[PDB]
């Protein structure tokens, strides 16, 4: 459920059971094992999922005013069609608090920001809405990564590497705040990952920007 903070406070009786869960060294695998409803094959990554389930640490930078290094957590899943990345994560859309689900060719860069047009309520047009700044700290389950124009995906460099936005149009000009973690389900230009041709080139990306990612399991 949602994130008001005040209307979600739990009782101490539940804290008993929570710290009970914490009292398992089995807990390292329990919740990763409780990720799927019924899926019992090679969950060895679900521990790597769970570091984003328990969605990251808050290393604040109200300390020095400098260098603003959030505990940025960024991981993507990529592979063949066999894996239920779209369906797993269609269900995980029914898990994530800030559950989004878009993908390559669902919405453009401006399909993510500045939904600007006329408003007969004011009897005037207005500067208007976006997608990501509603999903702060959240996730969008995403697939078909190698599908977008270069207009998008040079935005992602900006956010994945600074987690920021500063905008300039003829109407409103903005320096907003936007920041969150990834999930995605990228795909190659191929049908199967080509044997003896790594995703170092199989999926369609550059030379060390491919290397740039934290780790895509």
């Amino acid at each position: 459920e949602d994130e008001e903070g005040k209307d979600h406070i739990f009782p101490p009786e539940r804290v008993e059971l929570l710290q009970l869960l914490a009292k398992k060294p089995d807990i390292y695998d329990r919740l990763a094992r409780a990720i799927a409803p019924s899926i019992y094959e090679n969950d060895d990554i679900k521990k790597g999922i769970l570091l984003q389930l328990f969605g990251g640490t808050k290393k604040k930078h109200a300390t020095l005013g400098r260098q603003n290094f959030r505990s940025e957590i960024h991981l993507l899943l990529c592979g063949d069609p066999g894996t239920s990345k779209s369906q797993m994560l269609q269900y995980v859309f029914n898990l994530v608090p800030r559950s989004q689900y878009t993908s390559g060719r669902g919405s453009s860069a401006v399909g993510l920001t500045a939904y600007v047009t006329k408003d007969p309520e004011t009897r005037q047009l207005v500067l208007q809405t976006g997608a990501l700044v509603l999903a702060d700290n959240g996730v969008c389950c995403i697939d078909e990564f190698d599908k977008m124009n270069d207009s998008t995906r040079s935005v992602l460099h900006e956010v994945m590497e600074q987690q920021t936005l500063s905008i300039a149009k003829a109407g409103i000009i903005c320096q907003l705040n936007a920041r969150t973690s990834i999930l995605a389900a990228a795909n190659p230009a191929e049908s199967q990952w080509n044997k003896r041709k790594n995703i170092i080139d199989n999926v369609q990306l550059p030379h060390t920007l491919l290397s740039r990612f934290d780790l895509i399991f």
Binding site: A168, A170, G171, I173
Partner: protein, 271 residues
Amino acid sequence: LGPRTEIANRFQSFLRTFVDERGAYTYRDRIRRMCEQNMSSFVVSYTDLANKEHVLAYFLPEAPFQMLEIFDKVAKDMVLSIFPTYERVTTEIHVRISELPLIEELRTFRKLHLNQLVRTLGVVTATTGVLPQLSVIKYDCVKCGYVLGPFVQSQNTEIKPGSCPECQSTGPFSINMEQTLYRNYQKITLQESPGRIPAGRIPRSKDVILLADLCDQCKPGDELEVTGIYTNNYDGSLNTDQGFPVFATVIIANHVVVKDSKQVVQSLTDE
């Protein structure tokens, strides 16, 4: 009055008394030079005006309208009196100013600037073509078939007296298409330059009026400096209202100056 006669006298004892250019003042002869080329657009120096008599800087803004009128009256009463030869062609005058120690950029003028002395610049944009309006009020009686006669005209107001050759009668009437005085017209739409903006947003603009002497000089995208004065249409529909009066603002040009001005231009020093 005793003093309210002395305005024109100050002009008269100005234009042939305050003298510079090493004698033989301009306004001794510059007016002659205006009558020569058949212009009727004499222009006055505010600098030189203050160098003679500072008094008419404060006696202006209470009604610069009447100041300008009471000047050009003097130009007639001098011209046709000494140049009665003039009295065929145009025989009508108005004067200009070109010294105001000020540039008001746009987005700078507000309710305090109402109906008084102004300067500003901008850039031209698309506007109307070439048209005239009227200048004198006269109609035609039909009860008695007479003329209502010519009548004293207010700037945008009705007269309707009972006095007329029809036994001062004939409330009804009709109107002719001649025997009445005309006046050219043209408009402008002024924008602000792309240099002196507030650095990146949409610009502002207000409209400006030029008059019969003043047309076929401007063009879209031209360089400019104008005195002008601040207008007010006195009612853009007052009633049970908006959340706001639908009022607007214009400037009416007295003296326009081009800031390119690519013609042969300058006056002559005496030596």
